[PDB]
Each structure stands twice: as structure tokens, then as C-alpha cells.
Design a protein around this ligand. Structure first.
Ligand SMILES: Nc1nc2c(ncn2[C@@H]2O[C@H](COP(=O)(O)OP(=O)(O)O)[C@@H](O)[C@H]2O)c(=O)[nH]1
Ligand code: ALF
Ligand SMILES: [Mg+2]
Lengths: 303, 11
């Protein structure tokens, strides 16, 4: 028996890692399961394309084709709609505002789903597991989940990260064996939606610090997932780190940055001496990663 | 100010 807790700031991957704890250590998602997500899929997909639209009407961008302005007038109506969206997804234009997502709030899967629409409009569509992992739903108040692995009983707690939620965390603080803190690597240039004026990796650091170092967690295994490496690894190829860290003097490469960052985080340990941090680089959506890692992880706890 | 019980929640 085993209290596990997952923490992080908002949209860091937590709830996805919970999803796999389940595909991994159980059967995963069924059809009738897959199917109840159908509807999220679709939700997500709409709100994303819309937010891009919307966004253009602020950033003032211009569709590729004048033609697409009906298709847009008519997205809203509305909400054959796939047609619309497809069609828009592919305006040169809209894709410029999508490449600018960080001047706004767009979900992360926003392209995964959009880019795969033919596949999931066709009626009689059933989500896959990745389809399902890639979905978004805000976690609030806290969800417990059980499972046994390697012959422990894990009791897993899943919270929300927006700040507004952090409020209710303390009620889960007793008795904790392990924590997995998730950080979105790709956050290095985004600001917080609760607070446009905060960098998101900044806020994450703060928090980490406050957990890593919290007096309840002193005999707790602190595990840090840095995550979204997929996404990082792309970003990093065209947005620069100096944005989070204006003093980075390296080059911007997955390799070099990931590590700077690996680092800025690991140094907020105030007991580098007494207390170790066990850090992994993650893709919550990759099932094969995570499962890999979470083996690592447990065989640590075993301590 | 900023914290909630060791926890950083924001100003
Ligand atoms: N590409 C990618 N997407 C991810 C990863 N982790 C999470 N996501 C997507 O990010 C979103 C939010 O993570 P989420 O699970 O919701 O965590 P929670 O915010 O912390 O409750 C979901 O859409 C995830 O599908 C990742 O490593 N890589
Ligand atoms: F971290 Al919240 F959904 F984003 F769980
Ligand atoms: Mg969540």
C-alpha cells in the first residue's frame, strides 16, 4: 500500500498519466468506453478551431481565401460541419494563427484531431486509445483510483492545477509515499490562463518548489516528470528559451535546453543532500514510455 | 503572501 499523488500545474499531463495507469495495469479502454469519449473528442475539436478563428479576429489575420469567410460565419452557426472545418484547418491563413498559438489559448491536441478529421467524422467512429488520451477535461476536485502493480496497492490521487484548485490539496497530504510532479516542457513560452501575466514554467517552478520542499513530504519520494517532450522538441526549434530564462546562454536544442531546465528545477531542492529527486522525461500520451518509466518509478518506491 | 499551506497558489 501506497499513496500516490499527482501534482502539477494546470494542464501538465496529470490526468493523462492516470489514464495510462490503466491501460497499463488493466485493460484499458473498451469500445463502450472509447465511445463515451466520442463526444469530447468533438468538443475539443470544435472549440479549438474556433479559438483560432476567433483569434484571428484579434491578431488580425486573414484567411487565405476569401472564401473561407463563409465557412467561418458558418462554423459558429452553427455549433457538413466537418467539411467546414477541414476546409478551414487548411487555409494558409488559419494556419498562421495556429502557428501563433501562444498569443492565445489553444489546446494541445488541437492539431492531432484536426489533422485527422476524415477519420473521426465518418460516423460510426470510435475513439482509439490515443484518441482518448489526447482529450481534455479539466480535473477538479480530486479523484482516487486504485491499482495493483508489482504487488502494491496504489492509491492514486489526481488533482487540479489551476491555482484555484490548489486550494484543496492539503487534504491529501498525509501519508504520502510518492509524488509525481508533472511539468509541461512546452510551457516555456506560454503564460498562464489564470493570469496572462505569468509564465507558465515560471509558475511551475514556483510550485514545484513549494512541494519539493514541503514539510509533509520529507520522507516522500519526489518524482518529477517533465513532459510533453514531444512537443517541446518541436517548439524548441522555433521559439527560444530565453523567453523563460533570459539568461540562458546556450543553444536551443532539445538537448541543451531540456537540461538547463532539468536543472532549474532540480535546484529548488533545498535539501540536495538529504533528499533526492528522481526525474524522467515523459510523453504521457505515449503508452510505452510511460510504462517504462513508471516501472522505474516504482522500483524506487520500493524504498 | 502567495502561498496556502506551503503551497503556492498565487497573489
Ligand atoms: N503531446 C502530448 N500531449 C500531451 C501530453 N500530455 C498531455 N497531453 C495532452 O495535454 C492535455 C492535458 O493534460 P492533462 O492530462 O489534461 O492533465 P491535467 O491537466 O493535469 O489534469 C491533454 O490534452 C493531453 O492530452 C504529452 O506528453 N504530450
Ligand atoms: F490540471 Al487541470 F485539468 F488542467 F487537471
Ligand atoms: Mg486533468
Amino acid at each position: 500500500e501506497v499513496k500516490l499523488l499527482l501534482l502539477g500545474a494546470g494542464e501538465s499531463g496529470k490526468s493523462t498519466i492516470v489514464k495510462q495507469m490503466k491501460i497499463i495495469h488493466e485493460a484499458g479502454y473498451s469500445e463502450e468506453e472509447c465511445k463515451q469519449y466520442k463526444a469530447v473528442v468533438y468538443s475539443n475539436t470544435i472549440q479549438s478551431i474556433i479559438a483560432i478563428i476567433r483569434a484571428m479576429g484579434r491578431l488580425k489575420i486573414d484567411f487565405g481565401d476569401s472564401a473561407r469567410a463563409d465557412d467561418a460565419r458558418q462554423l459558429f452557426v452553427l455549433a457538413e460541419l466537418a467539411g467546414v472545418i477541414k476546409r478551414l484547418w487548411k487555409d494558409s491563413g488559419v494556419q498562421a494563427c495556429f502557428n501563433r498559438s501562444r498569443e492565445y489559448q489553444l489546446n494541445d491536441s488541437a492539431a492531432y484531431y484536426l489533422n485527422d478529421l476524415d477519420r473521426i467524422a465518418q460516423p460510426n467512429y470510435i475513439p482509439t486509445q490515443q484518441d482518448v488520451l489526447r482529450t481534455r477535461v479539466k480535473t477538479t476536485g480530486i479523484v482516487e483510483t486504485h491499482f495493483t502493480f508489482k504487488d502494491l496497492h496504489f492509491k492514486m490521487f489526481d488533482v487540479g492545477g489551476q491555482r484555484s484548485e490548489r486550494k484543496k490539496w492539503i487534504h491529501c497530504f498525509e501519508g504520502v509515499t510518492a509524488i509525481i510532479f508533472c511539468v509541461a516542457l512546452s510551457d516555456y513560452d506560454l503564460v498562464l490562463a489564470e493570469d496572462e501575466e505569468m509564465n507558465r514554467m515560471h509558475e511551475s517552478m514556483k510550485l514545484f518548489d513549494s512541494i519539493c520542499n514541503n514539510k509533509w513530504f520529507t520522507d516522500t519520494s519526489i518524482i518529477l516528470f517533465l513532459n510533453k517532450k514531444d512537443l517541446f522538441e518541436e517548439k524548441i526549434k522555433k521559439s527560444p528559451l530565453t523567453i523563460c530564462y533570459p539568461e540562458y546562454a546556450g543553444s536551443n536544442t532539445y538537448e541543451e535546453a531540456a537540461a538547463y531546465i532539468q536543472c532549474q528545477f532540480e535546484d529548488l531542492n533545498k535539501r540536495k543532500d538529504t533528499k533526492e529527486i528522481y526525474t524522467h522525461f515523459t510523453c504521457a500520451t505515449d503508452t510505452k514510455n510511460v510504462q517504462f518509466v513508471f516501472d522505474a518509478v516504482t522500483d524506487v518506491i520500493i524504498k | 503572501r502567495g502561498y496556502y499551506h506551503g503551497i503556492w497558489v498565487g497573489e
